[PDB]
C-alpha cells in the first residue's frame, strides 16, 4: 500500500520505478487484495484511499446472485432515479448487499459420454477410409493408369471425393447409433 501510494502520487520518479520492479512480486501478490477509491477529502481536495479487500468478500461479490442484484440495482437507478438521490440509493444497495454477502459467508461453512462416442466414431470411420491407403495395394491402380487417360484421371478424382462422402455418411450413422445406445 505504501509503495502503491508513492508510485501513484509520483508517476514520474525513475528511482521509485526501480523499487517498483524490485517489489513486482509482492505487489502482484497483493494486487487482488488492494482496494482503491477516491473521495472528496477534508482539505477540499480529491484524495485517494487504499484499504484491504478480503478474499471472502470478493468471492461473495462475484457470486452470481449478487451480480444479478447489482444489474437490477443499476437498471432501476438509471431508469427511475434522480442524480440527487443516486448516492443515497447506492449506499442503501451497498448496505443490503454487504448484509447478504456476510450471511452467505456465514452459512457457507465446512455430455462426456456423448462427446466420447462421437470422437470414437470419427476415429473409427476415418481409420476405415485410411485403411485403403495403408494397404499399399494401389499397385493395381498404378498398373491400370500406365495408360495416361483424362477419363481415368477424372474418374479417380471423383472417386476419392465419393469415398470421402460415403465415409461421412458412415460416420453420421455411427454417431446416431451411439446416441440411441447411450439414451437407451
Amino acid at each position: 500500500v505504501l509503495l502503491t501510494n508513492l508510485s501513484e502520487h509520483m508517476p514520474n520518479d525513475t528511482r521509485l520505478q526501480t523499487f517498483l520492479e524490485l517489489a513486482e512480486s509482492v505487489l502482484n501478490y497483493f494486487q487482488p487484495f488492494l482496494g482503491r477509491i477516491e473521495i472528496m477529502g477534508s482539505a477540499k481536495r480529491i484524495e485517494r484511499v487504499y484499504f484491504e479487500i478480503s478474499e471472502s468478500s470478493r468471492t461473495q461479490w462475484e457470486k452470481p446472485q449478487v451480480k444479478e442484484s447489482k444489474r437490477q440495482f443499476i437498471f432501476d437507478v438509471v431508469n427511475e432515479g434522480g442524480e440527487k438521490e443516486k448516492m443515497e440509493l447506492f449506499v442503501n444497495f451497498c448496505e443490503d448487499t454487504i448484509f447478504e454477502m456476510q450471511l452467505a459467508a456465514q452459512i457457507s461453512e465446512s455430455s462426456i459420454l456423448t462427446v466420447r462416442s462421437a470422437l470414437f466414431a470419427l476415429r473409427y470411420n476415418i481409420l476405415t477410409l485410411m485403411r485403403m491407403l495403408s494397404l499399399k495395394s494401389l499397385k493395381k491402380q498404378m498398373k491400370k493408369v500406365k495408360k495416361m487417360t483424362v477419363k481415368d484421371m477424372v474418374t479417380a478424382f471423383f472417386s476419392s471425393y465419393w469415398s470421402i462422402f460415403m465415409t461421412l455418411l458412415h460416420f453420421v450413422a455411427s454417431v446416431f447409433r451411439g446416441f440411441f445406445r447411450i439414451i437407451c
Partner: protein
C-alpha cells in the same frame, strides 16, 4: 419500451462513470482511460468494499480519512463521493 430502457441503461453505463459522472470522452484522451478510471479509481465495487471494511473495522483503529468518511456516513452526508471531479482532473498540470 423495455428494449429502449435496457439500451439506455447500457448507453449510460458505457458513456459516463457511475460515481463522478464525467463522460468517457474526457478519460479517453489517454488510451483505455475510461476503462482504467471505471475499474481502478471509481469502481462502485471498490466503494462497496470500502463501506464493508469501514463498518467491520473498529472505530478506534480508524485513520483520519476513515474517521472522516465514517462520520459523514453516520450523518448521511454524501459529499465525500466525488461529483464532477477526479484525481486526474485535479492534478492535470502535475500528472500530464
Amino acid at each position: 419500451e423495455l428494449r429502449d430502457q435496457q439500451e439506455q441503461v447500457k448507453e449510460d453505463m458505457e458513456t459516463k462513470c457511475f460515481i463522478c459522472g464525467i463522460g468517457n470522452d474526457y478519460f479517453d484522451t489517454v488510451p483505455h482511460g475510461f476503462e482504467t478510471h471505471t475499474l481502478q479509481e471509481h469502481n462502485l465495487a471498490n466503494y462497496l468494499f470500502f463501506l464493508m471494511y469501514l463498518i467491520n473495522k473498529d472505530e478506534t483503529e480508524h485513520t483520519g480519512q476513515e474517521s472522516y468518511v465514517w462520520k459523514m456516513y453516520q450523518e448521511r452526508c454524501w459529499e465525500f463521493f466525488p461529483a464532477g471531479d477526479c484525481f486526474r482532473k485535479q492534478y492535470e498540470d502535475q500528472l500530464n
